[PDB]
Each structure stands twice: as structure tokens, then as C-alpha cells.
């Protein structure tokens, strides 16, 4: 703890006698190699010490006498801190001292080739220190620096190498990472300085590249050139020998090929009209070099698979170069016949690279393939009189179709996930990298399919042939093929699609009969179903076939093989969603709609299915019932639909009426949970008309909820927290949650706020809300709050009147759980502020209708919300505050009183958040608020804040108030800084990104001690910008 930490820190920082390097080395070595206690404390001590305002004073000694690299490095961290924050207030002779010690040490170390065996790591840290110094005083106090080092590079080769590293780092700090670390204007200034003095350095680099035989030096030079390519003027790139020098002297030699190719890729990324020929040159030469190191006769898939890290890196870098260049400049090479062979080679390369089994590389390639297919599609969207660009790519397009069909990713991603409770459910991932991959392959293949229907159907038919004759037969391969077949659904004309499908399912059925073994047959059947389910147009077109299919599904719902039941249900819910009407209406050759038949055979259909599969089934049928429009018929359908679960439900409710303690019976609670899950799924499908069922069980349901709640609560009271880990309480909480889910689920899809408000809302008040209030802290289900939010979001005006009593049950008691820290009871913080957001957004008059003393508590709850380190809570908090300000602006009666009451408190709390590093995520919101608020002060606030209203105008008062507040909060700030910031608040109150940047600037300024009269805040550029923004 800070006991040992403080003690050791003080021992090291006493300053009354010689510093214990032995001890420091020991603490450091403990940190890098010690155990959790010893290491904890070492960590504590080192951080603690590093913080101290005078620790830097000892760094020189640390660098002078310490023998291990780690301690030196630590000392450098100590130094870096001072330079970063207190450099402008050190006694200047000390600054000079640090400058000399640092560049001197860098000379002595870098001018030793031992630097490698020496501490490369350590040297990087040194150079970084120098770059920090430069950042703090260049060129103002170091105007000859670039000349000095560029000149000193001609001295030694090692010195030059390290100098290249320094320049690179400086480039990174000035151009790449200046945002958030350097103020906007200072950043612009440094960028201008470097851009100005670049030609000198570029001459250095050109000299080194053209002449040096030193491999480390050359490499460092190239690595530096990479960043410079990130920012330098295009003349240096496209009007010098650079591109050539890279391709002829460096691209082919192994140890330089990667960096060289990366440089080339950066250059290739540039989109500029004037250097067409240079670009062509770039491509040609690059290609001619590539073919030497990666001949087109290479199995790039194997070459990657077996290959070492740099080989792999080179293949990836290659794919990047070709993809980049082709995407930005394909047109250039297209209109040059003399480049055909090269273009082809490039494409050929791509194809080879595509066969590589590595999803990242393949995504890189697929990016380009999708580009090409998209382009050719926009050129002309018609099949095989021929467009020019397409005619250029005709020799290889079918290879791309073949690639898409052959390597098609899985369409959906199913995942076995165990709930907050025990249950292992199947979770379908909705938006992931893999599904994105699939969607992109599908997109490309659809493009290419439109370009040629014949070629696509021919490819897939050949693949299927190859499945039948066993040449390419594998579960994986069959799956992939069918995934492709389904992926192009809708891309063909309906009659064509039918003609193609008939062939597909006929041959797949044949293959199913043909193969022997239940495994193979199961896989084939699964794929057949998948394809069928992906082609609903076909099913809708032909009723007899659809009926046949569905009957087959029902048949396979008994199949003992794993997967077949799952697939049967999954397919069934697809077909149900996409062909719902065909089950409600009477079809030709039928006396009754299919739904009646299904409902008449439900249990026989689902007797062998597991619970989750049954839910899927009920959901699927639920869609069919939703499809029936006649309210009466639909009501009867819903009634028969929910017969079986209602029987068990009724039995249990009866048992409970006779005796409540069966609600403590494990299997009973399980049954309840299952029944409720069925009701939820059903409700999702049917929608509003499900009310007839909901209303039927509603009050009973509420009762059981209550009971179980109470049960759970006591279980806490008796056995504390731990008791919430064993099966029973778990399954009970499950029942509560499914109850809430059912309620909010139906409310969300209810198209009558009146009825909901009068009927279904009042019982909740005592059944769930007052129960929530009644429960023990740990017993309270957070999912209550959230559900209420939903209801509010759905009702609004129809429930405003009820907002008070709701707040009686949940608000007060929930606060006390979440106002002692920011960590405990997270789901409650989340859901609570969700509810509060809902109320403020849809039922603001309720706030106008509640006592002031309580409104203070609400406002405080909001502030408290945006004070959170939890991202979503703070986010919602800021949103609420914004919409609340707007809401108040709407009601002109309360507006002035509200402003007069809370304006300054809000401002100061917000400012306390903005100046905090841990809240930067809400920057966009912060600005948006302050801007708005400050805008309001320009013309929309009639009353005056202080008694002397006349000497104290709104804007004036603000300016001096915010100024004094920030001055007292941050005493180390300068008057000019603060005044400039505060006028920046008014000047930019209609330019949000600018305001945001202004805030980032202030955030950087408050973290470093400028001190007295040191003015590198560039008031002219700043006040000019503020002026121009003020004009608009």
C-alpha cells in the first residue's frame, strides 16, 4: 500500500544525502521479475516516485551510476514527465543542462556501433526524450537544429542512422500523433516548420539511399521515409528519382523488400491527376521486381503456409500494394494495350494470393474483387454488344466467380452461450467480421451473376456434378456450394431461377438417395433444406411443393440424428416468415388452410423436439397466425395455438391456488419458465393481437411473479448474497425475467396506447414496481427499470399522469443503491438512467408537475450519470441533460426560473467533467451542450443572474464567472489562456467541431505548466480564427 510506497519513495527522494542506486535497481528488478506482493509494492513505489515534482533532479545520477537498462529507462520516464509538463517553469540553466546531457548522451551512444548490442530499447527512449525537448523548444530556442543534425549526419554512419530514427520520431509526433497532445495552433506551427526545413533532410535521405552500403542505416532511412511519405509534398515523391531508387535498388533485396514495398504502397495510394505516367512507371517497375521474388509459378497458399514471418508479411504487403494501386488507378493501365501482360500478371497475382488460407489476406483481396465487380456492374448491368472494361477482364472473371463459389463463407453464425442463469441457449450473432465477410462475398458474387447468368449457373451445376461423382465430395465442400447457391437468391429472373432450382434440388435429392450412411444423408438433407428456405419466391409460386416441403420438415422433426431437427426447425421458421400468407389463405385443392392442420397436429409434430426447438416452432407458427387478418378467425387461431401451454399453466396456477409452496418446487418453476418462454416467442411473432392470450394469463402471471420475487427476496435475507448462485433461485429469476420480457415485448408491438394505459399498466404498479421497492437490494431485478422505460417510450402522453407514482416505487430506493460509488450495481445504473431518459424524452410535463425539491434530486441524478466512468451511463446522462435543456426551452413559463436556478451549477459540473481526461469520450456531447447553453446566453435568457443586473449583463457575467471558476480550479493557468478559452466559448457556439477542438486545446493546456509570461499560445492566429468563426 501507499505506506511502504511512501516510505521507500521518501527514502529515495529525501535529497539530504547520496541516492541509493542499489535500492532503486532492486525495486525496479522487483517490478520486472518480482511476485505479486513484491511486484505490487515495487509498482506502487515507482509510480509514486515518478509523480514527485523533484524526482527529475535525481535522473542524471540514475543515468550516471545505474548499471541495468531498466532503471535507466525508468529515469528517462521521470525526465519525460518534467519535460512534458513543467519544462517552461524550470530554472532555465537546468533546462539547458538537460538539453546538453541528453543530446550529449545520444551522441556518445549513437556514435557507437555497439548501440545494437547496447540497449536499442533504451536508445529509442533517449531519442524520444530529445523529441520531447524539441517539441517544447523548437525552433524558437533551437533554430539551427535541423541544419545541425543534417550536417552531423555526414560525420558518422551510425550517428546518421540514429539521426534518421530521431527525425522519424519527430515526424510521428508532429504529423501523426499531434492531436490530443499538442494544441492546434502549435501543431500547425511545427508542421509548417518541418515542411519548410524538409528539402534539407530529403537531400540527406537521397544521399544516404543513393550512396550508402550500410544496411542498418539504409533500413532506418527507409523506415523514416515511410512516415515522411505520410506527410511530405508530392513533388519530392513524383518528381525525383525516389520511386525508381526504391524499385531498382531496394525492392528486390530481401532485407529491404518489405519496407520498400510499404513505401511503394503509400505512394500508390495517392490520387492525383498530374502524375499519370509516374504512376504507370511505378506499376510496371514494381511488377517487374515482384516477379523476381515471388514468381507467378509459386503456390502462394503453400508459400504463405510454410513461410516465415517476413515471407508472410511480404505476401500481405503485396496484396495491399496491388489492391491499393488497382483500386485507385485501374483506369490508367486499362487504356494502355502495351500493359496487358502486366495487368493480367497483377490480377494473376491476386488470384494466387486469394487461395491463401488466412482471413485477413482474403478480406484484402475480396475488397478488390468487390471493387472490380461493382465497377463492371455500374458500367453495364446486363449479361453476356460487349462493354469495353468488361471485355478487358473477360479472360479472368469466371475465375473470380469460381473463387466466390468455392470459398463462400458461412451465411449465419450460431453460438452456444450460457445465460446469466444456467440455461445454454443458441445465440445468433447479428453483426460480426465473419458475417460481414459473407455479405461481401455474396455481394461480389451477385454482381458477377448479373454480368453472366449462364456462367454462374454453369459453375454451380458443375460443382454439384462434382459432388455427385465424388470428385470434390466433402461435407465442407457441399456446404460451401449450397451456401453460394443460396447466396445468389433473387439475382436471376424467376423463370430462370425456377428452371435452375428444379435441377439443383432434383440432383441433390438424387445425391441424398445415392450416398450411403446416415451422416452423409443428414448433411445433404440439411443443405437441401437450406437452399429451399433461401428461395421463398419459388415456394410461393408452387403450393403443392411448399406443402410437401413443410410436411418433410415435420417428418424430420423426429429424426434422431443431431442437426436434422435443428435444421428442420430453423428452415421452418424461415419458410414461415417468408411464406406466412400461404398458410392462412385457402390454397387451390385444399378445403382448409394449412394452419388449421398444423394446429390440429401440434403435439404429434413436436413430441421429439427439445424445449428450445419447440419455442422456435411456436414462433414460426406465430408468424402464420400473424398473417391472418380477420380478427375473429385470428382470435380463434391464437386460442388453439396456445392450448397446450395454457393447460400446464392452468394446472400450475390451480396447484398454487391450493398451495403457494409449489412455487418453491424446482421442476414447477422450470415448467413456468418454459411456458413463459413459449409465450414470449409466440408474442414476438403474433404481435398486438396476442393480447387475447396475454390478458388471459396476465394477472395470474403477475401473481406468480410477485410470489417468486418475494421468495427470492427472503432467500437473500436468510442466506445473504451467495444464495443467488444455486439452481433454484436461478430458475426463479428466470421466470421473473421472462415475465418482464413478455410484458415489454407485447407493449412494444401494441398499436393502442389507450387500452394499454388503462388496462395493463395499473396492475404493474403493485405487482412489480411496489414489489421492486419492497425487495431487498440484492433481490431487485434491474430488468424492471428497463421494461418500464420501454413502456414509457411506447406510451408517453398516455402514461404521463402515472409517472409520479412509478417514481414513488423505483426512483428513491434505486438511487440509494447507486450513489455511494460508481461501480456497484451496474445494470441498475444503466437501466435506471435509461428509464429516466425515457421519462424526460416522452413525459416531460411530469417534471413540470412534481415538487421542486424532488426535481433537484432528478437533476442531481442526471449530473451523477454523466460523472460516470462507465461509458454508456455517462453518454445517456449527457443526452438527457441536452434534451432536458431543450424541453425547458419549450416551456416558456418554467424556462427563466430553471435558468436562474441551475444554469451555473450545470455549467460548473460539466466543466469539471470536460477538464477531466477520463471523460473525453463524451466530448462531442459536451461541446454540443455548452455551445447550446452559451448560444442561449447571447439572446434567449431575459432574467439576470445577479442582483446588480445592470453592471452584470448576461454575457459579461458569464465571461467573468467562467474565467474566475477556471482560474481558481486551475491556478497554474495564465489570464490570457483563460480569457481566450472563454471568448472561444462564445465565438464557436455555432461551430461544434471547432468547439470540440477548442475543448481539446484547453484540455492540453491545463495539463502543463506554462507559468509566467511565456506566450506560445499564438494569440494572433487563435483570435483570428475565433474572429472568422464569429463572422459566420
Amino acid at each position: 500500500m501507499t505506506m511502504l510506497a511512501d516510505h521507500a519513495a521518501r527514502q529515495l527522494l529525501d535529497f539530504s544525502q547520496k541516492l541509493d542506486i542499489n535500492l532503486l535497481d532492486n525495486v525496479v528488478n522487483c517490478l520486472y521479475h518480482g511476485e505479486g506482493a513484491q511486484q505490487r509494492m515495487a509498482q506502487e513505489v515507482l509510480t509514486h516516485l515518478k509523480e514527485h515534482p523533484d524526482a527529475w533532479t535525481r535522473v542524471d545520477t540514475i543515468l550516471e551510476f545505474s548499471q541495468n537498462m531498466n532503471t535507466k529507462y525508468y529515469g528517462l520516464q521521470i525526465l519525460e514527465n518534467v519535460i512534458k509538463t513543467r519544462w517552461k517553469i524550470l530554472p532555465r540553466n537546468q533546462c539547458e543542462g538537460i538539453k546538453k546531457y541528453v543530446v550529449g548522451l545520444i551522441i556518445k551512444t549513437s556514435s557507437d556501433p555497439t548501440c545494437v548490442e547496447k540497449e536499442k530499447v533504451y536508445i529509442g527512449k533517449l531519442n524520444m526524450i530529445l523529441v520531447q525537448i524539441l517539441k517544447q523548444e523548437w525552433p524558437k530556442h533551437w533554430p539551427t537544429f535541423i541544419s545541425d543534425i543534417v550536417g552531423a549526419s555526414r560525420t558518422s554512419e551510425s550517428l546518421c542512422q540514429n539521426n534518421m530514427v530521431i527525425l522519424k520520431l519527430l515526424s510521428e509526433e508532429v504529423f501523426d500523433f499531434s492531436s490530443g497532445q499538442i494544441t492546434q495552433v502549435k501543431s500547425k506551427h511545427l508542421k509548417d516548420s518541418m515542411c519548410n526545413e524538409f528539402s534539407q533532410i530529403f537531400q540527406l535521405c537521397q544521399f544516404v539511399m543513393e550512396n550508402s552500403q550500410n544496411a542498418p542505416l539504409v533500413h532506418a532511412t527507409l523506415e523514416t521515409l515511410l512516415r515522411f511519405l505520410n506527410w511530405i509534398p508530392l513533388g519530392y515523391i513524383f518528381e525525383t528519382k525516389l520511386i525508381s531508387t526504391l524499385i531498382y535498388k531496394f525492392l528486390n533485396v530481401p532485407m529491404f523488400r518489405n519496407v520498400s514495398l510499404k513505401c511503394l504502397t503509400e505512394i500508390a495510394g495517392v490520387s492525383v491527376s498530374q502524375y499519370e505516367e509516374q504512376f504507370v512507371t511505378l506499376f510496371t517497375l514494381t511488377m517487374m521486381q515482384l516477379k523476381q521474388m515471388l514468381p507467378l509459378n509459386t503456390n502462394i497458399r503453400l508459400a504463405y503456409s510454410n513461410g516465415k514471418d517476413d515471407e508472410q508479411n511480404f505476401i500481405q504487403n503485396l496484396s495491399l500494394f496491388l489492391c491499393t494501386f488497382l483500386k485507385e488507378h485501374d483506369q490508367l493501365i486499362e487504356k494502355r494495350l502495351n500493359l496487358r501482360e502486366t495487368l493480367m500478371e497483377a490480377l494473376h497475382y491476386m488470384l494466387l494470393v486469394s487461395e491463401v488460407e488466412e482471413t485477413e489476406i482474403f478480406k484484402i483481396c475480396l475488397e478488390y474483387w468487390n471493387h472490380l465487380a461493382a465497377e463492371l456492374y455500374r458500367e453495364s448491368p446486363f449479361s453476356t454488344d460487349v462493354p469495353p472494361r468488361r471485355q478487358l477482364y473477360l479472360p479472368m472473371l469466371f475465375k473470380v466467380r469460381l473463387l466466390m463459389v468455392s470459398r463462400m463463407a458461412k451465411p449465419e453464425e450460431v453460438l452456444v452461450v450460457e445465460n446469466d442463469q444456467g440455461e445454454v441457449v443458441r445465440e445468433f450473432m447479428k453483426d460480426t467480421d465473419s458475417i460481414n465477410l459473407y455479405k461481401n462475398m455474396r455481394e461480389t458474387l451477385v454482381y458477377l451473376t448479373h454480368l453472366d447468368y449462364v456462367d454462374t449457373e454453369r459453375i454451380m451445376t458443375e460443382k454439384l456434378h462434382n459432388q455427385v461423382n465424388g470428385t470434390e465430395w466433402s461435407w465442407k465442400n457441399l456446404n460451401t456450394l449450397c451456401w453460394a447457391i443460396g447466396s445468389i437468391s433473387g439475382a436471376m429472373h424467376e423463370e430462370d431461377e425456377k428452371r435452375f432450382l428444379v435441377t439443383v434440388i432434383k440432383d441433390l435429392l438424387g445425391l441424398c438417395e445415392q450416398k450411403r450412411g446416415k451422416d452423409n444423408k443428414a448433411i445433404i438433407a440439411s443443405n437441401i433444406m437450406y437452399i429451399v428456405g433461401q428461395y421463398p419466391r419459388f415456394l410461393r409460386a408452387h403450393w403443392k411443393f411448399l406443402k410437401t416441403v413443410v410436411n418433410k420438415l415435420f417428418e424430420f422433426m423426429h429424426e434422431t440424428h443431431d442437426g436434422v431437427q435443428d435444421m428442420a426447425c430453423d428452415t421452418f421458421i424461415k419458410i414461415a416468415q417468408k411464406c406466412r400468407r400461404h398458410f392462412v389463405q385457402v390454397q387451390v385443392g385444399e378445403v382448409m388452410p394449412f394452419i388449421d392442420e398444423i394446429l390440429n397436429n401440434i403435439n404429434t409434430i413436436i413430441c421429439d423436439l427439445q424445449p428450445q426447438q419447440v419455442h422456435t416452432f411456436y414462433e414460426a407458427v406465430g408468424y402464420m397466425i400473424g398473417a391472418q387478418t380477420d380478427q375473429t378467425v385470428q382470435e380463434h387461431l391464437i386460442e388453439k395455438y396456445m392450448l397446450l401451454p395454457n393447460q400446464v399453466w392452468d394446472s400450475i396456477i390451480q396447484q398454487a391456488t391450493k398451495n403457494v409452496d409449489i412455487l418453491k418446487d424446482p421442476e414447477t418453476v422450470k415448467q413456468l419458465g418454459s411456458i413463459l418462454k413459449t409465450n414470449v416467442r409466440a408474442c414476438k411473432a403474433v404481435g398486438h393481437p396476442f393480447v387475447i392470450q396475454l390478458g388471459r394469463i396476465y394477472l395470474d402471471m403477475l401473481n406468480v411473479y410477485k410470489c417468486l420475487s418475494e421468495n427470492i427476496s427472503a432467500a437473500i435475507q436468510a442466506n445473504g448474497e451467495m444464495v443467488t448462485k444455486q439452481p433454484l433461485i436461478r430458475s426463479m429469476r428466470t421466470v421473473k425475467r421472462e415475465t418482464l420480457k413478455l410484458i415489454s415485448g407485447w407493449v412494444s408491438r401494441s398499436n393502442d396506447p389507450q387500452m394499454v394505459a388503462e388496462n395493463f399498466v395499473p396492475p404493474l404498479l403493485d405487482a412489480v414496481l411496489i414489489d421492486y421497492q419492497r425487495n431487498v437490494p440484492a433481490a431487485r431485478e434491474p430488468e424492471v427499470l428497463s421494461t418500464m422505460a420501454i413502456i414509457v417510450n411506447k406510451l408517453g402522453g398516455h402514461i404521463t399522469a402515472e409517472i409520479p407514482q412509478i417514481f414513488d416505487a423505483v426512483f428513491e430506493c434505486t438511487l440509494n443503491m447507486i450513489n455511494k460509488d460508481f461501480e456497484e450495481y451496474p445494470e441498475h445504473r444503466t437501466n435506471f438512467f435509461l428509464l429516466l431518459q425515457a421519462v424526460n424524452s416522452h413525459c416531460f410535463p411530469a417534471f413540470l408537475a412534481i415538487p421542486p425539491t424532488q426535481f433537484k434530486l432528478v437533476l442531481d441524478s442526471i449530473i451523477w450519470a454523466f460523472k460516470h466512468t462507465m461509458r454508456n451511463v455517462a453518454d445517456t446522462g449527457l443526452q438527457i441533460l441536452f434534451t432536458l435543456l431543450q424541453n425547458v426551452a419549450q416551456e416558456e413559463a418554467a424556462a427563466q426560473s430553471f435558468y436562474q436556478t441551475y444554469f451555473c451549477d450545470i455549467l460548473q459540473h460539466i466543466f469539471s467533467v470536460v477538464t477531466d481526461t477520463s471523460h473525453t469520450a463524451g466530448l462531442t456531447m459536451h461541446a454540443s451542450i455548452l455551445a447550446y447553453m452559451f448560444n442561449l446566453v447571447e439572446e434567449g435568457k431575459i432574467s439576470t443572474s445577479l442582483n446588480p443586473g445592470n453592471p452584470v449583463n448576461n454575457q459579461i457575467f458569464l465571461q467573468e464567472y467562467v474565467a474566475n471558476l477556471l482560474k481558481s480550479a486551475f491556478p497554474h493557468l495564465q489570464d490570457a489562456q483563460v480569457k481566450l478559452f472563454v471568448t472561444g466559448l462564445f465565438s464557436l457556439n455555432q461551430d461544434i467541431p471547432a468547439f470540440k477542438e477548442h475543448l481539446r486545446d484547453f484540455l492540453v493546456q491545463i495539463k502543463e505548466f506554462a507559468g509566467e509570461d511565456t506566450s506560445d499560445l499564438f494569440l494572433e492566429e487563435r483570435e483570428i480564427a475565433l474572429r472568422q468563426a464569429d463572422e459566420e
Binding site: 517490478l31 520486472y32 505479486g36 511486484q39 509498482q43 506502487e44 515507482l46 509510480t47 515518478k50 531498466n70 529507462y73 525508468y74 520516464q77 536499442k120 530499447v121 529509442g124 524520444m128 510521428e172 501523426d176 500523433f177 510499404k262 504502397t265 503456409s305 508479411n313 500481405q316 504487403n317 495491399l320 485477413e360 484484402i364 453460438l415 452461450v417 445465440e427 450473432m429 447479428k430 453483426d431 460480426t432 467480421d433 465473419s434 458475417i435 460481414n436 465477410l437 460508481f822 461501480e823 456497484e824 451496474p826 445494470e827 466512468t869 462507465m870 461509458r871 454508456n872 477531466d916 481526461t917 477520463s918 473525453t920 469520450a921
Partner: protein, 172 residues
């Protein structure tokens, strides 16, 4: 002890600590109690070629609690940069973690993880994630909550360090 040093970096509220803890205990932490400086947890996997130990340096991603920062990166053998697919900022901050990291560790295997892919409102789309490409980093969508692609980072790193691309994890 055939063990490796893994450094885990990323913004605050990203999922680093929860991820490691779940890999340890098996539970899933609901609370956000920010890491201070660094917490190192030994974490073992059983491979077909014997056991392997990752000493995970769960570092703090809040600037306020940064601690020794890069100091923690010294002698690291591999790394996991992590961000939140529900917070675009955490992703835009990845190049910072990467620069600070690769300055101390010039040549180590690194995996970029998009965490919290279980949450529906995905802000950082898979389409937008490309930083690793030019940096030759390995990428994975993961979820410390629904356990999606839970062991892929450690598996890829293990393969890279050991040199056996066909290495696989086993029960015990």
C-alpha cells in the same frame, strides 16, 4: 517454465480485465472497476505439445491511472491491443497504443481484438476495422460475455511463439 510475457493494452472500459478474469475463474464481471497501473495474472493453457503459461500484464487504459505506461512493455514477448466495437473512440485510439507498444517491442506478435461484439448496437463496423492490415497485426472479433472467439487470440499467439501453426488447446 515455457512461459511468455503478454502485455494487454487498450482504452478504459474496453474489456481487458474482464477478459483475463473470465479466462481465469470462468465468471463474467458486470462492474467496471478500473485497473490501476498494472495487474499481472499467470494464465495457463494446455496444448497438444504440453502446457504453456501466459503472464498477462493487464494494464490500465485510463490516462489518469496509466502508471508506468510503456515501462510495463519492457521484455514483453507478445501483445493484445483491445478496443470496444460499441465505442468508436476506443478504436481511433488503437494507433496510440500500437505506437507506444512497438516502440518498446520492435518485433513481437500482436493481436487486435474488437470486444463486446455481443452488444447489438455495433458502432465500429467490421468494414471500418483495417488498422492491423498495414501493421501486419492479427485481428479478432471477440466477446468476453457471450464467449465469442474467446481463445483465438491466445491460440494465435501461442502458435506464433512456439512456431507450431497446428498447435491446439486441450481440456486439461
Amino acid at each position: 517454465q515455457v512461459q511468455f510475457k503478454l502485455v494487454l493494452v487498450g482504452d478504459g472500459g474496453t474489456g481487458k480485465t474482464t477478459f483475463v478474469k473470465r479466462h481465469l475463474t470462468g465468471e463474467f464481471e458486470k462492474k467496471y472497476v478500473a485497473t490501476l497501473g498494472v495487474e499481472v495474472h499467470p494464465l495457463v493453457f494446455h496444448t497438444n505439445r504440453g502446457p504453456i503459461k501466459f503472464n498477462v500484464w493487464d494494464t490500465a487504459g485510463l490516462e489518469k491511472f496509466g502508471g508506468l505506461r510503456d515501462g510495463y512493455y519492457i521484455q514483453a514477448q507478445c501483445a493484445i491491443i483491445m478496443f470496444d466495437v460499441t465505442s468508436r473512440v476506443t478504436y481511433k485510439n488503437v494507433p496510440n497504443w500500437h505506437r507506444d507498444l512497438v516502440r518498446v517491442c520492435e518485433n513481437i506478435p500482436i493481436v487486435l481484438c474488437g470486444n463486446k461484439v455481443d452488444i447489438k448496437d455495433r458502432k465500429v463496423k467490421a468494414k471500418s476495422i483495417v488498422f492491423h492490415r498495414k501493421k501486419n497485426l492479427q485481428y479478432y472479433d471477440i466477446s468476453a460475455k457471450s464467449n465469442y472467439n474467446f481463445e483465438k487470440p491466445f491460440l494465435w499467439l501461442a502458435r506464433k511463439l512456439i512456431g507450431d501453426p497446428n498447435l491446439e488447446f486441450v481440456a486439461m
